[PDB]
Amino acid sequence: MKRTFQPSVLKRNRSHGFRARMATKNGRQVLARRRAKGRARLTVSK
Amino acid sequence: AVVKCKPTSPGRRHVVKVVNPELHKGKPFAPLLEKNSKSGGRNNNGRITTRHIGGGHKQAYRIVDFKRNKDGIPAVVERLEYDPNRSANIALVLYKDGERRYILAPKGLKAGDQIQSGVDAAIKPGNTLPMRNIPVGSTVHNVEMKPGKGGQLARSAGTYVQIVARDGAYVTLRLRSGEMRKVEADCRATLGEVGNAEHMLRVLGKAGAARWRGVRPTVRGTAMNPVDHPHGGGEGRNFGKHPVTPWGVQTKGKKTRSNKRTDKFIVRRRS
RNA sequence: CUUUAAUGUUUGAUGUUCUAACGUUGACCCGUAAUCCGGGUUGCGGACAGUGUCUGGUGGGUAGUUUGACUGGGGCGGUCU
RNA sequence: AAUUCCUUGUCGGGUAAGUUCCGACCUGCACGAAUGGCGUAAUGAUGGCCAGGCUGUCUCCACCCGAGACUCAGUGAAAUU
RNA sequence: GCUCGCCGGAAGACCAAGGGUUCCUGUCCAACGUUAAUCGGGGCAGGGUGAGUCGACCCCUAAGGCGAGGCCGAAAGGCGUAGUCGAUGGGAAACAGGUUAAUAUUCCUGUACUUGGUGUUACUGCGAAGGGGGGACGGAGAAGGCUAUGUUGGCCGGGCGACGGUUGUCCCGGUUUAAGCGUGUAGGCUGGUUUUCCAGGCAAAUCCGGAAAAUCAAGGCUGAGGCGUGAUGACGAGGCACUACGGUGCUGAAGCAACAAAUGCCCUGCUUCCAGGAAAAGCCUCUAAGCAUCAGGUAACAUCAAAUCGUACCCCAAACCGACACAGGUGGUCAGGUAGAGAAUACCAAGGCGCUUGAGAGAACUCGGGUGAAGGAACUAGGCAAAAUGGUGCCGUAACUUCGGGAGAAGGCACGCUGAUAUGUAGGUGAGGUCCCUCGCGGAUGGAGCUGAAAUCAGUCGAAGAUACCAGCUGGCUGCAACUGUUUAUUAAAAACACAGCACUGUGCAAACACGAAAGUGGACGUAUACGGUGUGACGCCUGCCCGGUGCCGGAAGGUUAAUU
RNA sequence: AGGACCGAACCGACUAAUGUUGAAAAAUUAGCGGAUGACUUGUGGCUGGGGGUGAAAGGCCAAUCAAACCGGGAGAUAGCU
RNA sequence: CUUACCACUUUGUGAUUCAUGACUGGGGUGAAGUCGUAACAAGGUAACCGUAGGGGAACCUGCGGUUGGAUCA
Ligand SMILES: [Mg+2]
Ligand SMILES: [Mg+2]
Ligand SMILES: [Mg+2]
Ligand SMILES: [Mg+2]
Ligand SMILES: [Mg+2]
Ligand SMILES: [Mg+2]
Ligand SMILES: [Mg+2]
Ligand SMILES: [Mg+2]
Ligand SMILES: [Mg+2]
Ligand SMILES: [Mg+2]
Ligand SMILES: [Mg+2]
Ligand SMILES: [Mg+2]
Ligand SMILES: [Mg+2]
Ligand SMILES: [Mg+2]
Ligand SMILES: [Mg+2]
Ligand SMILES: [Mg+2]
Ligand SMILES: [Mg+2]
Ligand SMILES: [Mg+2]
Ligand SMILES: [Mg+2]
Ligand SMILES: [Mg+2]
Ligand SMILES: [Mg+2]
Ligand SMILES: [Mg+2]
Ligand SMILES: [Mg+2]
Ligand SMILES: [Mg+2]
Ligand SMILES: [Mg+2]
Ligand SMILES: [Mg+2]
Ligand SMILES: [Mg+2]
Ligand SMILES: [Mg+2]
Ligand SMILES: [Mg+2]
Ligand SMILES: [Mg+2]
Ligand SMILES: [Mg+2]
Ligand SMILES: [Mg+2]
Ligand SMILES: [Mg+2]
Ligand SMILES: [Mg+2]
Ligand SMILES: [Mg+2]
Ligand SMILES: [Mg+2]
Ligand SMILES: [Mg+2]
Ligand SMILES: [Mg+2]
Ligand SMILES: [Mg+2]
Ligand SMILES: [Mg+2]
Ligand SMILES: [Mg+2]
Ligand SMILES: [Mg+2]
Ligand SMILES: [Mg+2]
């Protein structure tokens, strides 16, 4: 029946968006961790 | 009056409501309201602190005003307004000064009637007066904890407190809880028994009421798994355990009361 | 000087009243076209309350574990030198 | 009896015949009064028993209309080993 | 292209969300379509979305989030004041035709509109982050009025009919047309106004709140639709010229009336009810500091400005969530004809389709269904499943009962069509003409025309007339749970949970308790007729005896007992 | 008026059949329950793991739940295969 | 031929009576068996009425009332 994935641009962003993952310590630590690992797209490109 | 209700439904059989026809039927004095916001029982962390809470109706906060001062200025009871916030029956006042406030409206909710509240005033049901002035053995009303706190006693319907001793600068009264309490004496406390009182005759009838009343259902202990409640029980009812709140504490004894920074005031413990 | 008494006297006991730490989720002022906060005034309470270190009690609310083996399957019973 | 082991207890009822059911008895292995006792109108995709109607559920299957199965053309799996 | 079948409160159309060139044209068919494939949402090229008025920005806030200083915490950080963000909600404005292979309240034509700056003219007190008013708000129900729009006649255009009949007294098609502008009406709310005084609205206020006198009553706000203008315009069946054969120019008749409706609008209404039903800005008004022929403010008009992004397409699906061109999931809008209570259903309109393997054969067996002699639950764990029952009105209906129910109990009768009553009745609707008037979206009286039940008589065809789809099986005894509800997403819906009622017990407010090392906060902007916890679980009748053990409440005299000295 | 009655949409899942390498990692068909309410739903927010949430079944917390997932401790330990 | 009324007769469901039944309520009779002794005298606690609870059984206790209570109370 109903699936487990009801999209919503806004949510998808503020939930795992740059600023968001940039408004907290670890969250911000995350990005770094990513850039370090050398990832193409950082967080939900757009 | 109360009046039961013709059993027309498998739930509308016990619906014994209560009514006060003299209660104004219309939107309240707008310039004395202000949101309300539903807490749902959550905390700042967004975590539920106290169970049983939620749903309910929109509800808009009145204003009441337990402070009540404007000493030396009269005012006639405009109307009698039903209050969603509390159980009592708020009543619009309106002083001859032009400014109109709210009140819990006591037993003598006689509409149209006039009432003052000055320091002098006159022992009459519905008049702000510091017990230091009012007589003794009076029915009082909205008693005030501290001198200018704002009154926090007998603010419910039917409530009432009777003075007893004005020894020194501290007056001793008797809360409806049957407890002997002392106050700074130099405290105001309207007058007359709080209005309504016949409130304690409700009944609701069907869950609906309690539900749309903001009161959520409650789950018993010896009905849920152990990991959830100390009364885990399970497997053919059972119990044996000691009746304790969901946190190991005999829900029978233990006063739990441990203020101490008040004893002085408290004279004859509640009984 | 020993046994026992009065005012001095210092020290432990309870018990009073005071204020000046301390509290105040009473009222007012100022920071201010702020019910947060801070300073001030006043009222109330007052060495209590609370807190810190040590400390007796309580404490499946929580936590780490233990809870044997021979057994004509294991258990029960019995046994273990 | 959602509690009765001996149990298909015994007796009455319904049956052509009833280890179920209904009404009783009391000998309650081992009900019992807010981990409520006994009744209760209305309510229930709730448990058990009965009757009428109804019928392919059956006696005892037959026929029939279509979807596959079968034959041809095309594409073309799997488990196992 | 002609037939045939399917959907049509969708399997049509439009928008959101999500998607991201899937849109159109051209081309090519390896790989991709469960095969082929000249075809496509496949490949490759180009082409393709035009706004002052639709939307987002923006203004305003909700929940909630962030947060100077600040209050706390080993650190990181928690919280939260001013404030600042944040819609799903409140703020101003454009319609009607036409056009493209693909755009469209954007482009074109016609006709309007919103607001700011600047200027002219008349008039006048202007001025806030500040006061007030308003914005601004619930449930259910009961009409009436109106539009949508349908049916029917009139009108206009076409047609005399492959087979018996069809000049009208018949058949087919059309009959449309907006914003804005004026009128302000069916109705809805409300009495105005001048003056005086004031402990209120933190200061002020002429505004709002209060108190006073006088004066007139026919005062003022709101309001669907209708009616004219829009619009001698457009559109419009229908034609003739060209064609690419899909399309292109030109031309262009009538274009009314009656009745019937809404789940739309009047209606943020009206009636009523208890569970008592956002905020903020825009808006109008009132003054502060201040300005003081100034500046400003109001109205008319001239003009300039209205920036920037989003507009393609799918959107109940082959573009979205399900690995697929997957029988599943997906919010909102529109609402045709006959029958019908009706958004069920049946057949059809507009519109969209035949679900991407076909062709034959006509075995057992599986699947889905139709029909069955006689029997009728013998089946079987159990009537599982099937078969049956079904509509409207009227007659009639048990024990029991909390007097509401039970109850559609049960069980029955009549139902089609045709003539009559009655040339279409009852009823609904409402045109003349006449009267009077403030004087017309006036009132009255008049009842043409339009539409139109059911009933009761008599007649009549079939085996049968609630003929299809659709649409209860019923009754008796007994356990359990009062009841509606909830629950093991994906084997359990129950006798389980929940409940309304009940009892014990804690809590005097900085409440008890819960979240939190803390601050802070829920409890509650409550206050013992309140809140928390625990057990019981409507209601009726009741709820006996035991305090030895355990726990709990109270006492503290004595015995024992920590740190400390 | 009513957690009132019948019944669509809507929400929910009582029974049976079919599917069980499905059309599908819970569905399709025929019946079925509620349907003005403790209803149902769009949109966005808050609760975080020994924690939340729970009309309580150990249910749910992204097809995972008697302690989610991701990374690390970490080549855990494995008298056993 | 057909229609109307209509007897027989059929079906469904209510009311009444008689009869009858596992079992059970008490009621009446004789043996007068067992447990007591309640009431009749002040009946050895004056009795009775109503009423409520309790109990092997008469009956006891609470509440009001009656005198149809003996002693001079
Ligand atoms: Mg359980
Ligand atoms: Mg526990
Ligand atoms: Mg369990
Ligand atoms: Mg179990
Ligand atoms: Mg443990
Ligand atoms: Mg260990
Ligand atoms: Mg061993
Ligand atoms: Mg029995
Ligand atoms: Mg029991
Ligand atoms: Mg139910
Ligand atoms: Mg082949
Ligand atoms: Mg492409
Ligand atoms: Mg295309
Ligand atoms: Mg293509
Ligand atoms: Mg803003
Ligand atoms: Mg913060
Ligand atoms: Mg919005
Ligand atoms: Mg002919
Ligand atoms: Mg588009
Ligand atoms: Mg298009
Ligand atoms: Mg396909
Ligand atoms: Mg196919
Ligand atoms: Mg047969
Ligand atoms: Mg049988
Ligand atoms: Mg058999
Ligand atoms: Mg069946
Ligand atoms: Mg059937
Ligand atoms: Mg039984
Ligand atoms: Mg139930
Ligand atoms: Mg399940
Ligand atoms: Mg199930
Ligand atoms: Mg229970
Ligand atoms: Mg029970
Ligand atoms: Mg008891
Ligand atoms: Mg209902
Ligand atoms: Mg229904
Ligand atoms: Mg179904
Ligand atoms: Mg899951
Ligand atoms: Mg290691
Ligand atoms: Mg390893
Ligand atoms: Mg005697
Ligand atoms: Mg005697
Ligand atoms: Mg007596």
From Swiss-Prot, chain A:
The keyword Cell membrane does not apply. One of its GO terms (molecular function) is structural constituent of ribosome. InterPro entries: Ribosomal_bL34, Ribosomal_bL34_CS. This is Large ribosomal subunit protein bL34. One of its GO terms (biological process) is cytoplasmic translation. HAMAP family: Ribosomal_bL34. One of its GO terms (cellular component) is cytosolic large ribosomal subunit. Keywords: Ribonucleoprotein, Ribosomal protein. It comes from the Bacteria. PROSITE patterns: RIBOSOMAL_L34. Part of the 50S ribosomal subunit. Belongs to the bacterial ribosomal protein bL34 family.
Swiss-Prot record, chain B:
The modification N6-acetyllysine is found at K241. Belongs to the universal ribosomal protein uL2 family. It comes from Escherichia coli (strain K12). Keywords: Acetylation, Ribonucleoprotein, Ribosomal protein, RNA-binding, rRNA-binding. Residues 27-52, 220-271 are annotated as: Disordered. One of its GO terms (molecular function) is structural constituent of ribosome. Part of the 50S ribosomal subunit. Forms a bridge to the 30S subunit in the 70S ribosome, contacting the 16S rRNA. Interacts weakly with S6 in one of the 3.5 A resolved structures. In pull-down experiments interacts with CedA. The lineage of its organism: Bacteria, Pseudomonadati, Pseudomonadota, Gammaproteobacteria, Enterobacterales. PROSITE patterns: RIBOSOMAL_L2. This is Large ribosomal subunit protein uL2.
